[PDB]
Design a binder for these strands. Structure first.
Ligand SMILES: [Mg+2]
Length: 214
DNA sequence: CCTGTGACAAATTGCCCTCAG
DNA sequence: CTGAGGGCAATTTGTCACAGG
């Protein structure tokens, strides 16, 4: 699929979006790059095509995901509103959106540091936290297509804005870690495992090690 | 403290059914 | 045929109360 290239800033940005909302942002960056005012646009047939949905169901996703963008902010470690104006359909099947102009810079490398991947790697993932992990792991991918990275549990909870109940490690393992690891080792070209780093009686970081299936 | 696990309810998800250009 | 709406049941995800170390 098209190859996405977002800055690590966003990749590490703290926010809470849905699958459909994230799928939507991918396309927003893409189209933006190969294009700023932020005034992007989305088509239902294309969307329905890329992600394999019926024209109808793709309409549900875009329409609901566009409302759920109201009031949501992005915190680049400076908080920013995703949109500055309500989305709107000028033509049947087409939606026009005004991404906060002030956000293009971040959505664009602006420097050597950045993250990239193809839509095929992340189009089969369902859990938005898993989409988050994958992208982060891709921030450490080497030309080989593998890597190893240690992440602070703290950082993960704060950036991925995980549910409060995942502050209790036994629940973070079950609902977040195990879940996202499997999802990736099944819906993406990545094959990964992990080791828990400890500080006596408590897990502090998570050591992720991954290698490309191909 | 810190773990793992069973219940439970709110969310999601892929389908299904209509209807107006 | 599209795509804008209205629903639905089966999973999932987010909480929490317990036993044990
Ligand atoms: Mg959907």
């Amino acid at each position: 699929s098209p190859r996405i290239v977002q800055s690590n800033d966003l990749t590490e940005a703290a926010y809470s979006l849905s699958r459909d909302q994230k799928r939507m942002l991918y396309l927003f960056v893409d189209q933006i790059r190969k294009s700023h005012d932020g005034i992007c646009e989305i088509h239902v047939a294309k969307y329905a095509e890329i992600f394999g949905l019926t024209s109808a169901e793709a309409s549900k996703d875009i329409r609901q995901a566009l409302k759920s963008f109201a009031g949501k902010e992005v915190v680049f470690y400076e908080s920013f509103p995703w949109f500055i104006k309500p989305a709107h359909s000028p033509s049947r099947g087409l939606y026009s959106v005004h991404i906060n102009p002030y956000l293009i810079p971040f959505f664009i490398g602006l420097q050597n540091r950045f993250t990239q991947f193809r839509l095929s790697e992340t189009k089969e993932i369902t859990n938005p936290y898993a989409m988050r992990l994958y992208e982060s792991l891709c921030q450490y991918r080497k030309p080989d297509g593998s890597g190893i990275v240690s992440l602070k549990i703290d950082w993960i909870i704060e950036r991925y804005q995980l549910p409060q109940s995942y502050q209790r490690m036994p629940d973070f393992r079950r609902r977040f870690l195990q879940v996202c690891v499997n999802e990736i080792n099944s819906r993406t070209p990545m094959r990964l495992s992990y080791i828990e780093k400890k500080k006596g009686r408590q897990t502090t970081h998570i050591v992720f090690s991954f290698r490309d299936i191909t």
